[PDB]
């Protein structure tokens, strides 16, 4: 009644038998842009099923020596399917998301992952270590795509802010003795009603082990983490040639 879930959107369907629940972000479900909030006058295209569907990015391995990974939205879908063509062919973009993270393990495995949504996850750097260099992150760290990027210092989230207060955003846990899926539903969060998908990323998705993975020699040592995500209430406006960046 609460540990089982089927998520159907589009031509896609996820099953889970070992769920917790669904987190609906900031108590707002995704919606479409009202005529009061809108400023642009062009008619937006609303492709219902060709972009609002579950996309599967890649698979990270939870090892003992893991530190964490982050993915930036909507950068993860700007080279993938029909979404990443409407987003390149258009200038404006608006959508929510349903993120769904998968990690399966046995009943003889232990560990926990914090799966959180951090809006406007701006990436800082070590500043040379001494704090004198005003270094900056390259493009393959702020918009790393579907491959994601490995956190160097996950205590401060590579932004000088503590991981411990990160439950103030959306989150779930994947505790392997309780659940193997983490489902968060995110609305469109920005000061503007639409924005560019290639220049601006609305939020980040952190997957950090707070408790480390452990097992005894003989069990399956490959414990994959798979990110699977669906746009929701997508909208595109301002059509011109396809530019990638």
Partner 1 sequence: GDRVADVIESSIGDSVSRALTQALPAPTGQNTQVSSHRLDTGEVPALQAAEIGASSNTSDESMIETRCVLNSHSTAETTLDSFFSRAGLVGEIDLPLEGTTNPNGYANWDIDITGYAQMRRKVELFTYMRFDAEFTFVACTPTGQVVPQLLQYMFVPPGAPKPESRESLAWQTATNPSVFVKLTDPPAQVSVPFMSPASAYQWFYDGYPTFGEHKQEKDLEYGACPNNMMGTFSVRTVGSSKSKYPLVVRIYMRMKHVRAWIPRPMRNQNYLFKANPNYAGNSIKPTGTSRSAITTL
Examine residue 41 and tell whether it contacts partner 1 (CB under 8 A).
no
Examine residue 5 and tell whether it contacts partner 1 (CB under 8 A).
yes
Return the number of other C-beta atoms located less than 10 Å from residue 29's C-beta: 13
One of 48, 63, 147, 214 touching partner 1 (CB under 8 A): 48
Stretch that binds partner 1, among 41-49, 77-85, 103-111, 206-214 (CB under 8 A): 41-49
One of 42, 61, 147, 199 touching partner 1 (CB under 8 A): 199
One of 55, 69, 121, 194 touching partner 1 (CB under 8 A): 121
| Contact flags string 65-84 toward partner 1, x per CB under 8 A | -------x------------
Find tokens 């995110």 and name the residue.
Answer: 186
Find tokens 């809006």 and name the residue.
Answer: 119
Return d(Cα 223, Cα 216) in angstroms, integer.
Answer: 13
Q: 228 has which bridge partners?
A: 56, 100
One of 57, 82, 198, 210 touching partner 1 (CB under 8 A): 198
Which of 42-66 are b and which e, b meaning 16 or more Cβ less than 10 Å from the residue's Cβ?
A: eebeeeeeebbbbbebeebebeeeb
Stretch that binds partner 1, among 58-66, 101-109, 125-133, 217-225 (CB under 8 A): 125-133
Examine residue 106 and tell whether it contacts partner 1 (CB under 8 A).
no
One of 41, 65, 191, 240 touching partner 1 (CB under 8 A): 191
Count residues near partner 1 (CB under 8 A): 96
Tell me which DSSP letter residue 44 carries: P
Which of 161-197 are b and which e, b meaning 16 or more Cβ less than 10 Å from the residue's Cβ?
A: eebeebeebbbbbbebeebbbbbbbbbbeeeebbbeb
Examine residue 127 and tell whether it contacts partner 1 (CB under 8 A).
yes
């Amino acid at each position: 009644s609460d540990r089982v879930a089927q998520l159907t959107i589009g031509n896609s369907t996820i099953t889970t038998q070992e769920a917790a629940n669904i987190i609906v972000g900031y108590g707002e479900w995704p919606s479409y842009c009202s005529d009061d909030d809108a400023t642009a006058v062009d008619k937006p295209t609303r492709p219902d099923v060709s972009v609002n569907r579950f996309y599967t990015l890649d698979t990270k391995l939870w090892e003992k020596s893991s530190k964490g990974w982050y993915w930036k939205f909507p950068d993860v879908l700007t080279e993938t399917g029909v979404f990443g063509q409407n987003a390149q062919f258009h200038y404006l973009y608006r959508s929510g998301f349903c993120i769904h993270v998968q990690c399966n393990a046995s009943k003889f495995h232990q560990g926990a992952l914090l799966v959180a949504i951090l809006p406007e996850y701006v990436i800082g750097t070590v500043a040379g270590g001494t704090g004198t260099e005003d270094s900056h992150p390259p493009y393959k760290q702020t918009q790393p795509g579907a491959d994601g990027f490995e956190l160097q210092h996950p205590y401060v989230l590579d932004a000088g802010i503590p991981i411990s207060q990160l439950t103030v955003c959306h989150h779930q846990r994947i505790n392997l003795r309780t659940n193997n899926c983490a489902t968060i539903i995110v609305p469109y969060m920005n000061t503007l009603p639409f924005d560019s998908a290639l220049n601006h990323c609305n939020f980040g998705l952190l997957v950090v082990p707070i408790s480390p993975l452990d097992f005894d020699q003989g069990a399956t040592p490959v414990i994959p983490i798979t990110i699977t995500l669906a746009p929701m209430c997508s909208e595109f406006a301002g059509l011109r040639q396809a530019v990638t960046q």
